[PDB]
Design an enzyme around this catalytic site. Structure first.
Site, PDB file in Angstrom:
ATOM      1  N   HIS A  61     -49.893  62.015  -2.645  1.00 34.37           N
ATOM      2  CA  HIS A  61     -49.638  60.595  -2.784  1.00 34.37           C
ATOM      3  C   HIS A  61     -50.487  60.010  -3.911  1.00 34.37           C
ATOM      4  CE1 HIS A  61     -48.688  60.930   1.728  1.00 34.37           C
ATOM      5  NE2 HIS A  61     -47.569  60.980   1.048  1.00 34.37           N
ATOM      6  N   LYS A  67     -41.981  56.518  14.651  1.00 34.00           N
ATOM      7  CA  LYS A  67     -42.906  57.502  15.184  1.00 34.00           C
ATOM      8  C   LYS A  67     -44.350  57.002  15.074  1.00 34.00           C
ATOM      9  CE  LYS A  67     -44.310  62.329  14.915  1.00 34.00           C
ATOM     10  NZ  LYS A  67     -44.902  63.306  13.998  1.00 34.00           N
ATOM     11  N   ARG A 119     -40.199  65.288  -2.919  1.00 35.42           N
ATOM     12  CA  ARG A 119     -40.709  66.640  -2.701  1.00 35.42           C
ATOM     13  C   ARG A 119     -39.572  67.622  -2.400  1.00 35.42           C
ATOM     14  NH1 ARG A 119     -42.928  65.757   1.545  1.00 35.42           N
ATOM     15  NH2 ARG A 119     -41.946  67.158   3.054  1.00 35.42           N
ATOM     16  N   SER A 122     -48.338  64.863   4.643  1.00 38.86           N
ATOM     17  CA  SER A 122     -49.251  64.389   5.669  1.00 38.86           C
ATOM     18  C   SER A 122     -49.085  65.243   6.921  1.00 38.86           C
ATOM     19  CB  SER A 122     -49.060  62.928   5.968  1.00 38.86           C
ATOM     20  OG  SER A 122     -49.538  62.116   4.900  1.00 38.86           O
TER      21      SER A 122
END
Lengths: 159, 173
Positions: free
Chosen positions: A18, A42, A91, A129
């Site tokens: 990031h 979430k 990504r 992450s």
């Protein structure tokens, strides 16, 4: 004249991937906001306050970057912030599909907002992450993938 | 503070932006025009870089491609059209460009585009690749498809600027 970009995400927590994306965006746009989603569907490991605090510290050295939380339609937030650019890191192939769909929706909601895509650097191309967390949860070394402040905070969350 | 430093690209705020948008543009379509218009809105300067000697023989030659693109993009003040016969990174370096515009239409291409970005990063670390999705309107059009449709008298007036449409019709008897 001015360019002002939003880089939205959950940033739970912010990674070197990031940081690379936002550093690159901040080099090409006048202003960049790291927009941290307050209420992701979430439940995140770090709360908004923690995420924002960590990201602020990790990005303090970038003068044209500001970290903020947001709990509204991104289009509405961008309009509120007078942003005209939306940064998204790309990504995986799986992500591209969803982000193209979102970009078409955002074009409908805010035609004056341009969505812009950056590939992650080769170095950070496999990190997320979620992956860093899962590795760290079972004591894997992730010192290479996080800034120090985030690393310390993550270790604390898991002890 | 020039006596001390010329300054660096990263970590010191926003810098002047010069983008190349390379392709064969054989011919330029409304899809390309949309991409470059969007890039020209966010970068100081943009060059439409038309590849001189592509692997697959183009319908229009470089002079025609450059001429058509120039006409179609003249209404954008910060856009210039040029041909090039080099790697996109060598042209970028020659032009003192720091941004590379790439259109991202298909999922099939994503892998190739990421690989190209990594190569360009190797060749020219100071060149940033930036990826734009085509508008929904232009998401299915390609030069190749418009040509093949046109060759069998399908209507493509909606996909090309008028100057390109006329030139294409002339190419096709």
């Amino acid at each position: 004249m001015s360019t002002k970009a939003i880089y939205p995400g959950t940033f739970d927590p912010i990674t070197n991937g990031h940081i690379d994306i936002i550093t690159r965006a901040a080099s090409m746009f006048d202003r960049v906001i790291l927009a941290i989603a307050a209420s992701p569907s979430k439940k995140p490991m770090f709360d908004l306050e923690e995420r924002v605090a960590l990201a602020t510290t990790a990005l303090q050295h970038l003068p044209n970057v500001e970290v903020m939380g947001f709990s509204d339609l991104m289009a509405n937030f961008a309009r509120a912030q007078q942003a005209n650019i939306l940064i998204r890191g790309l990504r995986a192939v799986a992500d591209f599909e969803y982000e193209m769909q979102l970009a078409h929706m955002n074009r409908h909601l805010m035609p004056e907002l341009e969505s812009v895509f950056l590939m992650p650097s080769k170095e950070w191309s496999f990190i997320s992450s979620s992956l860093v967390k899962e590795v760290a949860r079972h004591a894997g070394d992730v010192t290479h993938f996080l800034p120090a402040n985030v690393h310390q905070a993550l270790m604390e969350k898991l002890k």
